[PDB]
Write an enzyme that holds these catalytic residues in place. Structure first.
Site, mmCIF file in Angstrom:
data_model
loop_
_atom_site.group_PDB
_atom_site.id
_atom_site.type_symbol
_atom_site.label_atom_id
_atom_site.label_comp_id
_atom_site.label_asym_id
_atom_site.label_seq_id
_atom_site.Cartn_x
_atom_site.Cartn_y
_atom_site.Cartn_z
ATOM 1 N N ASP A 155 0.654 -1.408 0.049
ATOM 2 C CA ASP A 155 0.030 0.017 0.098
ATOM 3 C C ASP A 155 0.856 1.231 0.049
ATOM 4 O OD1 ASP A 155 -3.045 0.928 0.352
ATOM 5 O OD2 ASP A 155 -1.677 2.190 1.632
ATOM 6 N N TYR B 192 2.531 9.972 -0.627
ATOM 7 C CA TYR B 192 3.536 9.160 0.319
ATOM 8 C C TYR B 192 5.088 9.778 -0.068
ATOM 9 C CZ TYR B 192 -0.261 6.605 2.331
ATOM 10 O OH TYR B 192 -1.707 6.269 2.786
ATOM 11 N N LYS C 213 -2.927 5.805 -4.668
ATOM 12 C CA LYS C 213 -4.089 6.644 -4.668
ATOM 13 C C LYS C 213 -3.963 8.063 -5.360
ATOM 14 C CE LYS C 213 -3.922 4.679 0.081
ATOM 15 N NZ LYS C 213 -2.805 4.447 0.597
ATOM 16 N N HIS D 278 -8.095 8.856 -2.923
ATOM 17 C CA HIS D 278 -7.405 9.147 -1.509
ATOM 18 C C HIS D 278 -8.603 9.485 -0.491
ATOM 19 C CE1 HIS D 278 -3.191 9.343 0.299
ATOM 20 N NE2 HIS D 278 -4.215 8.910 1.183
ATOM 21 N N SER E 93 -11.345 5.576 -0.543
ATOM 22 C CA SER E 93 -10.865 5.653 0.724
ATOM 23 C C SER E 93 -11.386 6.719 1.391
ATOM 24 C CB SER E 93 -9.362 5.683 0.724
ATOM 25 O OG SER E 93 -8.589 5.751 1.984
ATOM 26 N N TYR F 164 -6.814 0.809 7.922
ATOM 27 C CA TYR F 164 -5.678 1.526 8.144
ATOM 28 C C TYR F 164 -5.419 2.164 9.508
ATOM 29 C CZ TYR F 164 -7.324 6.446 7.301
ATOM 30 O OH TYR F 164 -8.065 7.532 7.397
HETATM 31 N N1 LIG Z 1 -6.223 6.000 3.111
HETATM 32 C C1 LIG Z 1 -5.456 6.822 4.055
HETATM 33 O O1 LIG Z 1 -6.010 7.892 4.120
HETATM 34 C C2 LIG Z 1 -4.420 6.070 4.944
HETATM 35 C C3 LIG Z 1 -4.309 6.885 6.137
HETATM 36 C C4 LIG Z 1 -3.367 6.531 6.842
HETATM 37 C C5 LIG Z 1 -2.745 5.415 6.416
HETATM 38 N N2 LIG Z 1 -2.723 4.696 5.382
HETATM 39 C C6 LIG Z 1 -1.912 3.221 5.127
HETATM 40 O O2 LIG Z 1 -1.953 2.288 6.015
HETATM 41 C C7 LIG Z 1 -0.632 2.047 6.508
HETATM 42 C C8 LIG Z 1 -0.643 1.781 7.943
HETATM 43 O O3 LIG Z 1 -1.321 2.672 8.952
HETATM 44 P P1 LIG Z 1 -0.010 3.497 9.913
HETATM 45 O O4 LIG Z 1 0.731 4.051 8.982
HETATM 46 O O5 LIG Z 1 -1.080 4.545 10.620
HETATM 47 O O6 LIG Z 1 0.529 2.629 10.994
HETATM 48 P P2 LIG Z 1 0.005 1.200 11.610
HETATM 49 O O7 LIG Z 1 -0.037 0.085 10.737
HETATM 50 O O8 LIG Z 1 -1.062 1.566 12.539
HETATM 51 O O9 LIG Z 1 1.383 1.160 12.569
HETATM 52 C C9 LIG Z 1 1.671 1.849 13.755
HETATM 53 C C10 LIG Z 1 2.876 1.806 14.209
HETATM 54 O O10 LIG Z 1 2.912 0.378 14.730
HETATM 55 C C11 LIG Z 1 4.348 -0.223 14.695
HETATM 56 N N3 LIG Z 1 4.124 -1.764 14.872
HETATM 57 C C12 LIG Z 1 4.106 -2.595 13.643
HETATM 58 N N4 LIG Z 1 4.062 -3.596 13.836
HETATM 59 C C13 LIG Z 1 4.353 -3.835 15.219
HETATM 60 C C14 LIG Z 1 4.387 -5.155 16.187
HETATM 61 N N5 LIG Z 1 4.243 -6.332 15.430
HETATM 62 N N6 LIG Z 1 4.521 -4.662 17.435
HETATM 63 C C15 LIG Z 1 4.715 -3.458 17.991
HETATM 64 N N7 LIG Z 1 4.699 -2.340 17.083
HETATM 65 C C16 LIG Z 1 4.508 -2.550 15.610
HETATM 66 C C17 LIG Z 1 4.867 0.595 13.715
HETATM 67 O O11 LIG Z 1 6.192 1.053 14.261
HETATM 68 P P3 LIG Z 1 7.857 0.450 13.439
HETATM 69 O O12 LIG Z 1 8.002 1.124 12.259
HETATM 70 O O13 LIG Z 1 8.621 1.204 14.623
HETATM 71 O O14 LIG Z 1 7.802 -0.932 13.622
HETATM 72 C C18 LIG Z 1 4.056 1.481 13.488
HETATM 73 O O15 LIG Z 1 4.661 2.716 13.215
HETATM 74 C C19 LIG Z 1 0.293 3.216 6.169
HETATM 75 O O16 LIG Z 1 1.650 3.201 6.211
HETATM 76 C C20 LIG Z 1 -0.449 3.749 4.723
HETATM 77 O O17 LIG Z 1 -0.023 2.861 4.031
HETATM 78 C C21 LIG Z 1 -3.698 4.982 4.729
HETATM 79 C C1 LIG Z 2 -6.146 16.971 5.797
HETATM 80 C C2 LIG Z 2 -5.591 16.617 4.434
HETATM 81 C C3 LIG Z 2 -4.418 16.863 3.958
HETATM 82 C C4 LIG Z 2 -4.112 18.001 3.126
HETATM 83 C C5 LIG Z 2 -5.005 19.195 3.039
HETATM 84 C C6 LIG Z 2 -2.655 18.113 2.882
HETATM 85 N N1 LIG Z 2 -2.072 16.869 3.387
HETATM 86 C C7 LIG Z 2 -0.716 16.835 3.400
HETATM 87 O O1 LIG Z 2 -0.157 17.670 2.548
HETATM 88 N N2 LIG Z 2 -0.372 15.717 4.071
HETATM 89 C C8 LIG Z 2 0.898 15.776 4.636
HETATM 90 C C9 LIG Z 2 1.667 14.541 4.675
HETATM 91 C C10 LIG Z 2 1.182 13.470 5.165
HETATM 92 C C11 LIG Z 2 0.125 13.446 6.129
HETATM 93 C C12 LIG Z 2 -0.391 12.144 6.711
HETATM 94 C C13 LIG Z 2 -0.308 10.832 6.289
HETATM 95 S S1 LIG Z 2 -0.789 9.690 6.840
HETATM 96 O O2 LIG Z 2 -1.845 9.806 7.838
HETATM 97 O O3 LIG Z 2 0.056 8.642 6.995
HETATM 98 N N3 LIG Z 2 -1.611 8.854 5.479
HETATM 99 C C14 LIG Z 2 -2.830 8.986 4.654
HETATM 100 O O4 LIG Z 2 -2.531 8.091 3.910
HETATM 101 N N4 LIG Z 2 -3.676 9.637 4.724
HETATM 102 C C15 LIG Z 2 -3.944 11.080 5.555
HETATM 103 C C16 LIG Z 2 -4.051 11.990 4.647
HETATM 104 C C17 LIG Z 2 -5.308 12.101 4.039
HETATM 105 C C18 LIG Z 2 -6.259 12.283 4.916
HETATM 106 C C19 LIG Z 2 -7.887 12.659 4.286
HETATM 107 C C20 LIG Z 2 -6.659 11.040 5.750
HETATM 108 C C21 LIG Z 2 -5.220 10.803 6.409
HETATM 109 C C22 LIG Z 2 0.828 10.875 5.182
HETATM 110 C C23 LIG Z 2 1.396 12.136 4.654
HETATM 111 C C24 LIG Z 2 -3.113 16.252 3.983
HETATM 112 O O5 LIG Z 2 -2.888 15.311 4.796
#
Ligand SMILES: NC(=O)c1ccc[n+]([C@@H]2O[C@H](COP(=O)([O-])OP(=O)(O)OC[C@H]3O[C@@H](n4cnc5c(N)ncnc54)[C@H](OP(=O)(O)O)[C@@H]3O)[C@@H](O)[C@H]2O)c1
Ligand SMILES: CCC1=C(C)CN(C(=O)NCCc2ccc(S(=O)(=O)NC(=O)N[C@H]3CC[C@@H](C)CC3)cc2)C1=O
Length: 315
Positions: free
Chosen positions: A45, A50, A79, A112, A161, A211
């Protein structure tokens, strides 16, 4: 270990989260994506937002060239960022992602967020008073241009998303709809389990993808430092002892047994390898009910302008 999507394609139930904050050097993303593949993650993902698609794509090319995997074993998601919602901007944004990753196609492509922003190549456009510049776009048109990217083979599957029920329905009730969204990728963990949204999504064959399933990365720029630490929860720790596992493993397995596809980000080799052990054990019905009762409607991600907009999904 996959789920069949509503367009006939297969999505691995466990996916690798690739985001790291800009303090982490961009070479790390290359290196940990390779370790995740080595460990057995097949679903990966990423996003335009990113700043890592070049490195994530190069990791995948590396694991193919060394003969560990083929292209078709890998499920890759990108995304479409909210500056590219106008229909004419959609295909070029995707082609741009593909060029950076050096892939011919993405397995999955997502809107996204429903919250549109001013077109441009600023990620966060702001006016003279430092306020985020929002745009207004009929998302049904943005969807039609996503459909076209699928017809063209540039995305094997398309989904959304950060949509709520109302926003999904708007796509589902669109006249002339060719393709439903395969999924809705949203914040989902035991403190924000999204059960209503999940039941709605099950009723339309839309997969909810979780996520921040481990409690987010807690980045001080957009996560309240006073929020409770998910992996420190007492019910989760108690369940980690019972099963001789860890609280992260309890968090991930939860989502699998309720039919959620679950993402897990780790840049640490030992935690990357630990996380594929989600497949080695089961929670009981009671264990599952104990985790259900942890919901607090707690979202980790919060922004000054996100909680504001006309397309804000939580309103
Ligand atoms: N669609 C969206 O808007 C959106 C938004 C947010 C995220 N995402 C996606 O979702 C992914 C995951 O979400 P997230 O980035 O919020 O992090 P997460 O998967 O909730 O993980 C949070 C933390 O837990 C730690 N961790 C992982 N495995 C572990 C284990 N087995 N034991 C203890 N700690 C552990 C990691 O640290 P370490 O690095 O120290 O292992 C990580 O920083 C993102 O990277 C992104 O690809 C999408
Ligand atoms: C408020 C939305 C927004 C702007 C407006 C500008 N801007 C931005 O410049 N970003 C800064 C870098 C960043 C922040 C969070 C993450 S995150 O939280 O790890 N990853 C995610 O994919 N989604 C997050 C972003 C999208 C929202 C809707 C859900 C959470 C990844 C990267 C935003 O974020």
């Amino acid at each position: 270990q996959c789920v069949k999507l509503n367009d006939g394609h297969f999505m691995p139930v466990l996916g690798f989260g690739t985001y790291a904050p800009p303090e982490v050097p961009r070479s790390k993303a290359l290196e940990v994506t390779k370790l995740a593949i080595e460990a057995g993650f097949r679903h990966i993902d990423s996003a335009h937002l990113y700043n890592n698609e070049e490195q994530v794509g190069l990791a995948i090319r590396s694991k193919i060239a060394d003969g560990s995997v083929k292209r078709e074993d890998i499920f890759y998601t990108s995304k479409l960022w909210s500056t590219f919602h106008r229909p004419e901007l959609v295909r070029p944004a995707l082609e741009n992602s593909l060029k950076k990753a050096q892939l011919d196609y993405v397995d999955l492509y997502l809107i996204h967020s429903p919250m549109s922003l001013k077109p441009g190549e600023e990620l966060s456009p702001t006016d003279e008073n430092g306020k985020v510049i929002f745009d207004i776009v009929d998302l049904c048109t943005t969807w039609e241009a996503m459909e076209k990217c699928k017809d063209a083979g540039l995305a094997k599957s398309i989904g959304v998303s950060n949509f709520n029920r109302r926003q999904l329905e708007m796509i589902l009730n669109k006249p002339g709809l060719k393709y439903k969204p395969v999924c809705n990728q949203v914040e989902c963990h035991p403190y924000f389990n999204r059960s209503k949204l999940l039941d709605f999504c099950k009723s339309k064959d839309i997969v909810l993808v979780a996520y921040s399933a481990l409690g987010s990365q807690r980045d001080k720029r957009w996560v309240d430092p006073n929020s409770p630490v998910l992996l420190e929860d007492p019910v989760l720790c108690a369940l980690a002892k019972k099963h001789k596992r860890t609280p992260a493993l309890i968090a991930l397995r939860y989502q699998l047994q309720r039919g959620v596809v679950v993402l897990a980000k780790s840049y640490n080799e030992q935690r990357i390898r630990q996380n594929v052990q989600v497949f080695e054990f089961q929670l009981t019905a009671e264990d599952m009910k104990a985790i259900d009762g942890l919901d607090r409607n707690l979202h980790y991600f919060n922004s000054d302008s996100f909680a504001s907009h006309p397309n804000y999904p939580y309103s």
